[PDB]
Design a protein around this nucleic acid. Structure first.
Lengths: 177, 115, 87, 61
RNA sequence: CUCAUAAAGUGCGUCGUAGUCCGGAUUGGAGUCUGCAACUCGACUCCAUGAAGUCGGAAUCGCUAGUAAUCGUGGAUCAGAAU
C-alpha cells in the first residue's frame, strides 16, 4: 500500500537536489519506543485497569509492569514500587500506524489548527502537542469512559536541522510557516 | 458524563452539571439545554444515552483548555519582550525601587538567593 | 510626594486640539513639545508624539498610562543597550 | 492651541460673523464659560475663592 | 416631572444539613461610569470559576413583646469618594 514507496522511491529524490552524498545515512529498522502518560498522582489503585485495556486495542499484546533497580538515592523512593511500565516492539508493525494515523480522522477533530511551532532545535527527536479529546476511526463513539490523550514521538538519526522534516511533510500534514 | 475537556460532572442537575466547565456556566447552561431539548431538573445519571450525545456535539463547538491558556501566555510574552512597564510588572523581578537592584542590595534582600 | 489635588497641568494648547479630534472619534498621531502636561482620558486611543529633544516619538496613550506625564514615556538619552538586546 | 484660539481674530474665516464663539480669558476653555465674566466654570470658582471677583460671594445654606 | 421600587408582609413554590442551581468568597476575561484621575482606593455587573460551612478552639457581647435577631429606605455634613 501507500507506505512501501517510502524506502526506495521517495528516499533517493530527497537526497539529490539538496544533499549530494551516498545512499545510506539518510534515512533503517530498529524498534520505535512508545511511552505512556504518567499515571502516577492522578488517582489511587486504579487507572492501571483502564490502562493496557485501551492500549491493547490500537495495537497488539499488553503492556508490562516493570519496576526500577533496587538502589535508594536522594529522593523519596522505596524498594519494590511499580514505575514506568513500558513495552516497545516491532518487526514490520511500526509502518501502518503511520498511515491510519495521519490521513483519516484528521483533519476531522473539532478545532484543529494547522500551524505548528518549531518543536526541536538541534536534535532529531521532534515533539508534539495533542489535547484530551480526539476522534479516531478505530475507536467507538459512545461507550468509552474517560477520554485518553497520549503524545506521539519519532526517533531519527539526523545531523542538521534541515535535510530533515522534508520527509515528514511528505505525508504528514498540515504544517504551515 | 464525558463532554468537553475531560469533565466528570457526577451527581448533579443538568444545569450546574455544565456550570463546572471553565467554558460554559449558568447562562450557557439554560441555552444549551433549551436548544437540545433537555430537562434542567434531571440528574446526570438519569440522562439517556441519546440526550448526552446531542449535548456533546453542541458543546463541542467552543473554546477551552490549553489552546486557550497558551494564547494568554503569548499575550503576556508579547508585551514582556517589549519596553512596557506592564510587561515588567508581570515579572516583578525588576527593581521595585531608588538605589540599584542589580547589585549591592542585600541590606533589604538578605542572604544571596539561588539564581 | 506627588501632588495634583484639583489643579492638573494640561498645556492649554495640547488640550484644546486633542478635544477637537473628539468631534467624531480620534485623529492620526499628533505632536506636542511641552511634555510637562499630564495624560488623561480624552487622550485615550490617540497617538501623541513627544519631543525627546531631537525628534517626536509616537506614544500610544492607554488607560493604564493615564496620570503619568508624556515626558515619562519619552526617553531623553539613548542607550544602545550594548547587547543582544533581547526582551 | 494658540492656533485653536483663532477666536481672538476679529475677522472670521469664510463663515459669517456668527462664527465668533467665546473662549475663556484666563484658561481659554470654550466648553463651559460665563458670558457675564467671560471666564470658564473652573476659573470663576478659583477667582471666587480668591475674592478677586468683586460683588461675588459664595452662596451658603 | 423625577429620585421611588418602601422593605417586610400577602398568595405560591423550592428545601430539611447531601459542599447538591443550596452558600456566595476568591480569581481570570470583557466592559460602562462619577471624576481633570481612580495601579495602590471605587461602585456595579456581563462571562467564567465558585472555597470556607451543615450552626465553628481559649473567651466574650446586645436583648425581655412588637421587643430581640434580621432586611430595606431617607436625611443632616456635602462640588465630590456616607460599610
Amino acid at each position: 500500500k501507500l507506505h512501501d514507496y517510502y524506502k526506495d522511491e521517495v528516499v533517493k529524490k530527497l537526497m539529490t537536489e539538496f544533499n549530494y552524498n551516498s545512499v545510506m545515512q539518510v534515512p533503517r529498522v530498529e524498534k520505535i519506543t512508545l511511552n505512556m502518560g504518567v499515571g502516577e498522582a492522578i488517582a489511587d489503585k486504579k487507572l492501571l485497569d483502564n490502562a493496557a485495556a485501551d492500549l491493547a486495542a490500537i495495537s497488539g499484546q499488553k503492556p508490562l509492569i516493570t519496576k526500577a533497580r533496587k538502589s535508594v538515592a536522594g529522593f523519596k523512593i522505596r524498594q519494590g514500587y511499580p514505575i514506568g511500565c513500558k513495552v516497545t516492539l516491532r518487526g514490520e508493525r511500526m509502518w501502518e500506524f503511520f498511515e491510519r494515523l495521519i490521513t483519516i480522522a484528521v483533519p476531522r477533530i473539532r478545532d484543529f489548527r494547522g500551524l505548528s511551532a518549531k518543536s526541536f532545535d538541534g536534535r532529531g527527536n521532534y515533539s508534539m502537542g495533542v489535547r484530551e479529546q480526539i476522534i479516531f476511526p478505530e475507536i467507538d463513539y459512545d461507550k468509552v469512559d474517560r477520554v485518553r490523550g497520549l503524545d506521539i514521538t519519532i526517533t531519527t538519526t539526523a545531523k542538521s536541522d534541515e535535510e530533515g522534516r522534508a520527509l515528514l511533510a511528505a505525508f504528514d500534514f498540515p504544517f504551515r510557516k | 458524563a464525558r463532554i468537553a475537556g475531560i469533565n466528570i460532572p457526577d451527581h448533579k442537575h443538568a444545569v450546574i452539571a455544565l456550570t463546572s466547565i471553565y467554558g460554559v456556566g449558568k447562562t450557557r447552561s439554560k441555552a444549551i439545554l433549551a436548544a437540545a431539548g433537555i430537562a434542567e431538573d434531571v440528574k446526570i445519571s438519569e440522562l439517556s444515552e441519546g440526550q448526552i450525545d446531542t449535548l456533546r456535539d453542541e458543546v463541542a463547538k467552543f473554546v477551552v483548555e490549553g489552546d486557550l491558556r497558551r494564547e494568554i501566555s503569548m499575550s503576556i510574552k508579547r508585551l514582556m519582550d517589549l519596553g512596557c512597564y506592564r510587561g515588567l510588572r508581570h515579572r516583578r523581578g525588576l527593581p521595585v525601587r531608588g538605589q540599584r537592584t542589580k547589585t549591592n542590595a542585600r541590606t533589604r534582600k538578605g542572604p544571596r538567593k539561588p539564581i | 510626594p506627588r501632588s495634583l489635588k484639583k489643579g492638573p497641568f494640561i498645556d492649554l494648547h495640547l488640550l484644546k486640539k486633542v478635544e477637537k479630534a473628539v468631534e467624531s472619534g480620534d485623529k492620526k498621531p499628533l505632536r506636542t513639545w511641552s511634555r510637562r502636561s499630564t495624560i488623561f482620558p480624552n487622550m485615550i486611543g490617540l497617538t501623541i508624539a513627544v519631543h525627546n529633544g531631537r525628534q517626536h516619538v509616537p506614544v500610544f496613550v492607554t488607560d493604564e498610562m493615564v496620570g503619568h506625564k508624556l515626558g515619562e514615556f519619552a526617553p531623553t538619552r539613548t542607550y544602545r543597550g550594548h547587547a543582544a538586546d533581547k526582551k | 492651541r494658540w492656533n485653536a484660539v483663532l477666536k481672538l481674530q476679529t475677522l472670521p474665516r469664510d463663515s459669517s460673523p456668527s462664527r465668533q464663539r467665546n473662549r475663556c480669558r484666563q484658561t481659554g476653555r470654550p466648553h463651559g464659560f460665563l458670558r457675564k465674566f467671560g471666564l470658564s466654570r473652573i476659573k470663576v470658582r478659583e477667582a471666587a475663592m480668591r475674592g478677586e471677583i468683586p460683588g461675588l460671594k459664595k452662596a451658603s445654606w
